[PDB]
């Protein structure tokens, strides 16, 4: 009925480091490593909301669909209602707004004795016949680097008897993200994240989320 906005605010802590990617537009003169996406001003690593939204949608598409989902526009009611759908007039604008995650504990990381906020992992491949190695370099955000994760969920008139299902979907999306890796070569041990201090606060309108915060802490 009434309009409200619930802001899920968390801290993404990198258990392992994170290689989001991007192209060599901020790459240093002489560096041959694959760069990580960086702020154009501070050059600190960031987690773009596009990667979070894409990985969360792909993970939830294997749980809340029970269909084929050849394309993103074919997703179910429960997912297109939150993440949006370009081929449905009722779900063109989703109720979930993701935000870019920026570094927050740079001071703490410096107090921990860190020379640079990004590291260069050397990593090779071995031929199984000739035993000849071909090394390369991958740039990753360092471990124990927290980012501010802000997600905004609107509660309009259509958000009757569906807010709890949306909360469940958001919770299990974060759970699946913790169970999986954020963007990168996470099949070798990258991108492992953990969401800390996960709480929901009504930033606009009137809504009681006292039953949501305890249930957030109880599982996630």
């Amino acid at each position: 009925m009434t309009f409200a906005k619930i802001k899920f605010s968390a801290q993404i802590r990198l258990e392992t480091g994170l290689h989001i990617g991007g192209s060599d537009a901020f790459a240093a003169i002489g560096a041959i490593d694959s760069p990580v996406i960086k702020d154009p001003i501070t050059n600190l690593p960031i987690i773009p909301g596009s990667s979070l939204k894409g990985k969360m949608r792909t993970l939830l598409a294997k749980v809340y669909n029970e269909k084929v989902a050849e394309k993103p526009s074919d997703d179910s009611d429960i997912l297109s209602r939150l993440f949006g759908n370009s081929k449905d007039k009722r779900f063109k604008m989703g109720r979930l707004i993701f935000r870019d995650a920026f570094l927050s504990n740079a001071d703490e990381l410096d107090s921990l004795g860190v020379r640079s906020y990004t590291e260069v992992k050397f990593e090779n491949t071995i031929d199984r016949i000739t035993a000849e190695a071909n090394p390369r370099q991958i740039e990753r955000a360092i471990r124990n680097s927290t980012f501010d994760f802000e997600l905004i969920y609107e509660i309009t008139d259509e958000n009757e008897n569906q807010v709890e299902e949306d909360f469940k979907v958001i919770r299990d999306g974060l759970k699946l993200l913790e169970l999986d890796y954020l963007g990168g070569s996470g099949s070798r041990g990258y991108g492992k994240v953990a969401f800390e201090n996960l709480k929901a606060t009504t930033v606009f309108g009137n809504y009681d989320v006292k039953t949501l915060n305890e249930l957030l802490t109880a599982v996630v």
Partner: protein, 352 residues
């Protein structure tokens, strides 16, 4: 959906996973039966408050030190400094870290670094364990360890990297087996569990160990590390749940192919599922030795360090340790000359 396994790794022998860097002789001091590895930034900071920057520059810029101007302890003693606390870390003296003595001229001119994260603590990357697991699975499967694993359509034989399908293929469902096996990396396991082992080679034709000037930083024996292996598909789930009984089969093939020719008192015994991690373990532990035999030898036929027959056995030296297993007292090695099989470890995999 996802099956998560815990892999507990217990090193039975020193394990080295380098990063390309090397401590030169002017970065560590051998004294008080320990190897101190000072941080050069803090070293410079406390020798600019003591006004010895210029002679330090002359000590490090120097291109050809003869015998003793190559050691940092020589600089420390020449200029009368006794303030050895500039960050860093210390490695307890093994005893067996090197032939000759750690003093005098030759000693240890280079120490291969262990892989360390941005905070300076060591860890085992998940890609190293994944490479070992991939070698185990490929070498124990007749559809992957066959004649199709070589690519003779070229100048020299090389591995058929597309024998196991990978990558996105146009108009085809995803068929990547090893994207499902998501091996994570360890946690920082502190700098107190490292030693300075040296590479020795044992030739079956000569029957004596030959030391080599290749010194490494390796994890001490009897070190417990924990990895998480997340699997998403049923095929890779069956493969990982069979990682034990596949490691045993791979080790049985390896023992009947290579390790049987060497004296049984050098080859170690297994408490848990065998595995070979890190550098210096040998080429056969990193290859499909059923197919790579003949090709790998021919790669080195025209070099000075010729590979003769199937090669030599890599046997480092680290202190003997005995485990009070609930069966008796199991010594790690069967020889009194303190000869570990470098790069060996054991593991147990559960389904937590």
């Amino acid at each position: 959906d996802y099956r998560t396994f815990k892999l507990s790794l217990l090193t039975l022998a020193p394990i080295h996973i380098g990063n390309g860097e090397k401590y030169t002789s002017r970065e560590f001091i051998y004294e008080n039966k320990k190897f101190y590895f000072p941080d050069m930034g803090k070293f410079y900071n406390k020798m600019v408050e003591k006004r010895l920057a210029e002679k330090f520059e002359a000590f490090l810029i120097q291109t050809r030190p003869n015998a003793r101007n190559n050691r940092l302890i020589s600089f420390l003693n020449d200029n009368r400094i006794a303030e050895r606390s500039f960050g860093g870390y210390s490695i307890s003296e093994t005893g067996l870290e090197s032939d000759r003595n750690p003093n005098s001229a030759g000693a240890i001119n280079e120490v291969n670094k262990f892989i360390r994260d941005a905070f300076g603590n060591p860890y085992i990357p998940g890609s190293s364990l994944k490479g070992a697991i991939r070698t185990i699975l490929m070498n124990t499967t007749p559809k992957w360890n066959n004649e199709n694993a070589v690519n003779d359509f070229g100048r020299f034989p090389k591995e058929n990297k597309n024998l196991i399908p990978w990558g996105p293929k146009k108009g085809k469902e995803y068929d990547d087996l090893f994207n499902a096996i998501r091996v994570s990396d360890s946690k920082p396991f502190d700098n107190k569990r490292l030693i300075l082992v040296q590479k020795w080679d044992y030739s079956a034709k000569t029957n004596k160990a030959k030391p080599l000037p290749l010194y490494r930083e390796s994890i001490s024996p009897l070190t417990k590390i924990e990895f998480e292996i997340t699997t998403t598909t049923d095929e890779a789930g069956r493969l990982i749940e069979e990682l034990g009984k596949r490691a045993q089969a791979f080790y049985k093939d390896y023992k009947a192919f290579f390790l049987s020719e060497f004296p049984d008192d050098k080859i170690q015994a297994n408490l848990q599922y065998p595995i070979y991690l890190g550098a210096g373990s040998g080429a056969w532990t990193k290859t499909l030795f059923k197919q790579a035999d003949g090709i790998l030898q021919r790669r080195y036929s025209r070099m000075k360090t010729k590979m003769v027959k199937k090669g030599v056995l890599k046997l480092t030296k680290a202190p003997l340790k005995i485990v009070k297993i609930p069966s008796g007292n199991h010594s790690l090695i069967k020889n009194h000359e303190s000869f570990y099989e470098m790069g060996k470890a054991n593991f147990m995999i559960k389904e937590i």
